Design a protein around this ligand. Structure first.
Ligand code: 90B
Length: 292
């Protein structure tokens, strides 16, 4: 984990404000002053607690363990000087859910499926590294200028044995239940198979351009529907094979869900033979329009 000297970091614009600190777009001078790259910079403001420090630096320490095209890349940290900083590659199009909501209907099916393949490859890498994400959702995916999607949001509570915060978000809040598999909701059994359930929800988010899973249903109403066997209906214009794959991610019995390797393989097969994506699942209309 590379310690960066503050003289190598310039902050150009705020892109996110927080209670704990801010996130900036900036530049990082690297390679002994011979290179310069755009970066995102997150700070931890003075007065942070020991827990806030361990969580903050812990996320960087985990990110530094990974080297994959579909996982956000860590440049390094500033810990010896204040404010402390985590510095990553800069993802020009921000969070995937917001990106899709601002680009509604503008991508092809093949582009959407390609985004899902990248996310699945990142998740396959994480799962094979024995990292369970626990909060996989489009809001935790970032998108670059070239439409590459990368998994982000990481924390020590996911790796430490019997962490008292293992069932919370990386901020200490409640993991939004509508992305979470039933056995993780009810028994706190988080595994890569519960991440697969979450990935299925991400597939639905992508194919709907960022719709809210289960629409207006409350959390208890979502739990009621899932445990009754209800599942999200097919998005509009969604390939049958893609909807079948998300349905398999949502099998109640976790051993019946695909592994991330299966997901990557299936998505690859569909992209390579794109006529396979022309068979569309029937979209259930929610409004009767009677016309001649
Ligand atoms: C710095 C850091 C520390 C710890 C964990 C992580 Cl994942 C990070 N890195 C980051 O948060 C980020 C990396 N890239 C980011 N890109 C980003 C985020 C946000 Br908010 C907004 C924008 C951004 O300004 N996006 C444009 C402007 C608005 N519409 C189109 C997208 C970019 S945030």
């Amino acid at each position: 984990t590379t310690e960066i000297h503050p003289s190598c970091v310039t902050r150009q614009k705020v892109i996110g404000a927080g209670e704990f600190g801010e996130v900036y777009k900036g530049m990082l001078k690297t390679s002994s002053g011979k290179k310069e790259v755009p970066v995102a910079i997150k700070t931890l403001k003075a007065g942070y607690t020991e827990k806030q420090r361990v969580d903050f630096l812990g996320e960087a320490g985990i990110m530094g363990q990974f080297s994959h095209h579909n996982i956000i890349r860590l440049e390094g940290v500033i810990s010896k000087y204040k404010p402390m900083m985590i510095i990553t590659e800069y993802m020009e199009n921000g969070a995937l859910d917001k990106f899709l909501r601002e680009k509604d209907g503008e991508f092809s099916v093949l582009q959407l499926v390609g985004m899902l393949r990248g996310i699945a490859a990142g998740m396959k890498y994480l799962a094979n590294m024995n990292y369970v994400h626990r909060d996989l959702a489009a809001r935790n995916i970032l998108v670059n200028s070239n439409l590459v999607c990368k998994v982000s949001d990481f924390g020590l509570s996911r790796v430490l044995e019997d962490d008292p915060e293992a069932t919370y978000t990386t901020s200490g809040g409640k993991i939004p239940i509508r992305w979470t598999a039933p056995e993780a909701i009810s028994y706190r059994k988080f595994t890569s198979a519960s991440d697969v359930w979450s990935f299925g929800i991400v597939m639905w988010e992508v194919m709907t351009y960022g719709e809210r899973p289960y629409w207006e249903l409350s959390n208890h109403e979502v739990m009621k529907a899932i445990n009754d066997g209800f599942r999200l209906p097919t998005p509009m214009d969604c390939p049958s094979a893609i909807y079948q794959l998300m349905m398999q991610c949502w099998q109640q019995e976790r051993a019946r869900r695909p592994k991330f390797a299966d997901i990557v393989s299936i998505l690859d097969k569909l992209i390579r033979a794109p006529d396979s994506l022309k068979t569309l699942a029937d979209f259930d209309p929610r409004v009767s329009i009677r016309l001649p």
